[PDB]
């Protein structure tokens, strides 16, 4: 019956105003002392999910309002 | 327990609180040999809450 949302995944993929899926980067929870100032700044920020993995993410949670660019 | 990361706080911005622009101790965690340099480190460094270039006291 009416699709349950994959609320394990949902909590890692937000969608932006224009409609792109966005995630947080992996790496910077602990063992921070040994990494640079530089790379922690790139690991702070959000970027798109790669076009490859859209299929799995959209497929998991089907109430997103997500526009693959068309 | 031979070469260890250690907690360089500030002596500048010792722990205060109130009045919106909150003070909030700066900190630097970095490594020294425990055996080589037995007395605690006392480096000078930048602290973005002081806006100066304070002494960063060692502790634990």
């Amino acid at each position: 019956y009416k699709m349950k949302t994959h609320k394990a995944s949902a909590k890692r993929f937000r969608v932006t105003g224009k409609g792109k899926i966005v995630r947080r980067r992996a790496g910077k929870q602990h063992l921070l002392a040994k990494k640079n100032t530089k790379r922690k700044n790139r690991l702070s920020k959000l970027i798109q999910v790669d076009r490859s993995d859209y299929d799995n993410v959209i497929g998991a949670l089907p109430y997103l309002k997500v526009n693959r660019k068309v | 327990d031979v070469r260890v990361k250690v907690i360089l706080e500030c002596t500048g911005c010792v722990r205060k609180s109130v009045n919106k622009g909150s003070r909030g101790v700066s900190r630097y965690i970095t490594q020294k040999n425990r055996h080589n340099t037995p007395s605690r480190l006392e480096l000078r460094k930048f602290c973005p809450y002081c806006y100066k270039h304070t002494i960063h006291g060692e502790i634990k």
Partner: protein, 90 residues
């Protein structure tokens, strides 16, 4: 009205005798497929990425207040002495 695919009724109709599923293996068999998002035992994306700051224990997402209109959007709905432009009239 398209007229669909009654599937597996001769090799001329096309999708016949195995019915466009190739040759054995997990996706061929009857029944449910897999988990969706499953990466094969490799750690799935949806479980090797951290979870979006606020939504990670409490903090209700910023659900919008106020029902925003704009001055640009009002002008199209015209009235001279616009008697109380409010929740009623709009």
């Amino acid at each position: 009205r398209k007229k669909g695919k009654r599937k597996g009724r001769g090799h001329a109709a096309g999708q016949g005798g195995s019915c466009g599923f190739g040759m054995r293996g997990q996706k061929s068999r009857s029944g449910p497929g897999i988990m969706r998002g499953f990466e094969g035992g490799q750690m799935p994306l949806y479980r090797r990425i951290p979870k979006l700051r606020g939504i990670a224990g409490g903090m209700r997402a910023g659900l919008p207040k106020y029902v925003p209109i704009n001055l640009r959007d009002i002008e199209v709905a015209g009235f001279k002495e616009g008697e109380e432009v409010s929740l009623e009239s709009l």
